[PDB]
Design a protein around this nucleic acid. Structure first.
Lengths: 150, 125
RNA sequence: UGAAAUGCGCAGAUACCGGGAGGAACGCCGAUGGCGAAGGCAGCCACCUGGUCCACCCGUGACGCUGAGGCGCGAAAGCGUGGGGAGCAAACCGGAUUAGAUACCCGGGUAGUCCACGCCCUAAACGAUGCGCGCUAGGUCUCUGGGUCUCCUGGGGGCCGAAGCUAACGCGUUAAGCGCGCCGCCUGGGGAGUACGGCCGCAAGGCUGAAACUCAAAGGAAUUGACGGGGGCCCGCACAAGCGGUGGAGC
């Protein structure tokens, strides 16, 4: 596709690769620093509001957000039917992370000088401890679309 | 009503619509379906291979209660659908049956033909 | 139908079942097959009838070949009289498309297409290759007969190819090869299959068939190239995947 999967250096605070990916999703204009800060501050936000350790909260969020099945269009003899299909494990992560950041940006709450609260709140809302929020919606909606046209 | 299990299925295709009726080994019809039978309206319902498919299944399912299992399929007439799908129209019905759950013993084409009734119009002849 | 419309349908169409009437054609088998001199000929049954191959080599004993003119046969369309007419369909009547559409597409529809009797006699009537005979490697598939029947032998249909032939393409025991016999035919292109005359025909038309004038070509095959919603293989931020943006505002 775009290119071969490049391996990402694990996170400085918690040496989790998945985290860095998330951070990359947040960052824009290569402002890697602001991006890391927002995620870290959110993690701190996750600590206070929620007793649980942030790393666990985030991972659980991504799980709720990953779509198992997605619908892809295809041209049949008549009309382009939307064929439902599985999603690559690689694909699911990129979608989940992307959707979180997008929904997070979606939130009204403008907290912290930046975005940092929206990420914090979004992740918790995602958790399935709380499996709500805009991110999960998209995920649920896609799956629903699939198997509709089973 | 009274379980039969073995019987005949008549698929009558036409450019207008598909009607399938299932019958006993004897020839007396157990149940029948068509595109009209299912709620689909005149143009689309009637012909569309999709419709033929639905009608075929409805015919089988209804027949299932009768305890039908194996059936001999008889195809009469040619016809299909306008639909984008390949729409042989008749074939879909033949397919829906094989899949419906009934085991189809055989498919037979016995489209009737006149000796020569009257002149056809419709750009035929 | 590309989309449609004309059209048909509530006097009930379409789709479905049963009954009847009528005309035309004969699915599968079916072939890369078979028959005939050609045109041409395919449901099944019987009658009448032509051609043709093979085996035995039994009979006649050169009785042979070709064949100007004749006579006959001769796809389709077409003509005459009568019959028939389901489907199809020139002309025609409409719908659409289009710049226009006297067309292509769609709905109708007469002659005709079918039968009989008579006439017409044409064609890319083609293998674009007259008939007979003899001689000149094979290989392969096939239809039909005989045999000592994992193959030989005779007749036929195809493919590939020796020698050779041919401008090339190609032909090559199914000759376009090597020979002989006889028939028909050609002699640059246009004018022209016209004019005139004759013969034939009910008619349409057919057969035969020029001249003046005019042009340096007309032409065959093959070569390189340019040109015009097939197949295979493969690329590029070409698409897809993804991030940011133009199209909105002011400048």
């Amino acid at each position: 596709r775009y290119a071969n999967k490049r391996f990402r250096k694990a996170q400085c605070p918690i040496i989790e690769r998945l985290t860095n990916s998330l951070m990359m999703n947040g960052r824009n204009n290569g402002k890697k620093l602001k991006a890391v800060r927002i995620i870290k501050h959110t993690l701190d936000i996750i600590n206070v509001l929620t007793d649980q350790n942030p790393i666990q909260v985030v991972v659980d969020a991504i799980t709720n957000t990953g779509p198992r099945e997605d619908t892809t269009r295809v041209g049949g003899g008549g009309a382009a039917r939307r064929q439902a299909v599985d999603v690559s494990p690689l694909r699911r992560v990129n979608q989940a992370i992307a959707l979180l950041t997008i929904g997070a940006r979606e939130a009204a709450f403008r907290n912290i000088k930046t975005i940092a609260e929206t990420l914090a709140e979004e992740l918790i809302n995602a958790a399935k401890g709380s499996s709500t929020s805009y991110a999960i919606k998209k995920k649920d909606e896609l799956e629903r679309v699939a198997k509709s046209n089973r | 009503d009274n379980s039969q299990v073995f019987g005949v299925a008549r698929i009558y295709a036409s450019f207008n619509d598909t009607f399938v009726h299932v019958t006993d080994l004897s020839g007396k019809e157990t149940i029948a379906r068509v595109t009209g039978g299912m709620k689909v309206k005149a143009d689309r319902d009637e012909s569309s291979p999709y419709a033929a498919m639905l009608a075929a299944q409805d015919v089988a399912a209804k027949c299932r209660e009768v305890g039908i299992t194996a059936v001999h399929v008889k195809i009469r007439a040619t016809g299909g659908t306008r639909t984008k799908t390949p729409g042989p129209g008749g074939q879909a019905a033949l397919r829906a049956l094989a899949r419906s759950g009934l085991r189809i013993g055989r498919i037979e084409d016995v489209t009737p033909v006149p000796s020569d009734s009257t002149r056809k119009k419709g750009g035929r002849r």
